[PDB]
Structures are given as C-alpha cells and as structure tokens.
Amino acid sequence: SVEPYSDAAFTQAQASGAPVLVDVYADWCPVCKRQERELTPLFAQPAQRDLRVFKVNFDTQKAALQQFRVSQQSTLILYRNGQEVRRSIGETSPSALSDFLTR
C-alpha cells in the first residue's frame, strides 16, 4: 500500500509486523520525480505485497522529518518489524532501488 504520512497510520503500520518504507519527497524535486517513477511498479510486485509505504512531504511535515532524522528530499528509509534496517538518499538506479526493497 501507499499512503500519505500520518502519525496514526505510521504507528499502526510499525506495530503490525509488516515492512514499512518511509519515502520523503518534495513536489519540486526532479530526483524525487524520477524515484517515484521507478518505485511505483516495484511497489506492485509480489515481493512487495506486505510493504506499507508512507509518503512524507519534506515541505509540510517537519515533525516527521525530525522523527526520521531526515535532512534531504529523496531519502528512503526501510523498516522491518518496527526498526530501521537501512536508508538511502538520492538513489535512482532501478536495480539499486529494487535491491533496497528486497535484500
């Protein structure tokens, strides 16, 4: 699933046991645009079937940025079982983004 970040939906996703992707975007970022392109089909693939994606708007959700220790748009943070596994900034290789979600 893909949904806008909110406190309540994020906390419920983290308590669910499912993997969670925090995707920090900006409406005027060509990298972000580019990422979104390549991530959208990856989100629909069977290996991603349990992934809960939250889109954090860099411009409007500043409390979320502090929580996630995020200083740049195009940051991706992957959680499993409620704990951060890895993060990535600015990556636009389709194979690298696939592997970021999969490994």
Author numbering: 0 to 102
Show passages lifted from the paper:
The structure was refined to an R-value of 17.7% (Rfree = 21.5%) with good geometry at a resolution of 1.98 Å. Trxlp displays a similar structure to that of the canonical Trx fold, consisting of a β1-α1-β2-α2-β3-α3-β4-β5-α4 topology. Trxlp contains a central β-sheet composed of 3 parallel (β1, β2, β3) and 2 antiparallel strands (β4, β5). This central β-sheet is sandwiched by 2 layers of helices: a bottom layer with 2 helices (α1, α3) and a top layer with the other 2 helices (α2, α4). The structure obtained here is in reduced form, as evidence by the 3.3 Å distance between 2 sulfur atoms of 2 cysteines in the CXXC motif. Trxlp can be superimposed to Trxs from other species, with root-main-square deviation (rmsd) values ranging from 1.54 to 1.74 Å for around 100 equivalent Cα pairs. Minor conformational differences among these structures were observed in flexible loop regions connecting α helices and β strands. Trxlp shares a conserved structure and critical WCXXC-motif site not only with bacterial Trxs, but also with mammalian Trxs. Notably, either mutation in Trxlp (W50F, C51/53S, FSXXS) or mutation in ASK1-TBD (C250S) significantly impaired the interactions between them. Taken together, unlike the classical Trxs, Trxlp might not exhibit robust redox activity.
The gene of ETAE_2186 was among the top 3 upregulated genes and was annotated as a hypothetical thioredoxin; here, we named it Trx-like protein (Trxlp). In this study, we found that one of the most significant infection-induced E. piscicida genes, trxlp, could be secreted and translocated into the cytosol of host cells upon infection, showing a conserved crystal structure to the host thioredoxin protein. Furthermore, Trxlp could mimic endogenous TRX1 to directly target the TRX-binding domain of ASK1 (ASK1-TBD) and inhibit its activation, subsequently suppressing Erk/p38-MAPK signaling, correlating to limit bacterial virulence and replication in vivo. Taken together, our results provide the first comprehensive, functional analysis of the E. piscicida Trx family protein Trxlp, a novel virulence effector that mimics endogenous TRX1 to target ASK1 and suppress its activation, thereby inhibiting the phosphorylation of Erk1/2- and p38-MAPKs and disrupting the expression of inflammatory cytokines and diminishing the host antibacterial defense.
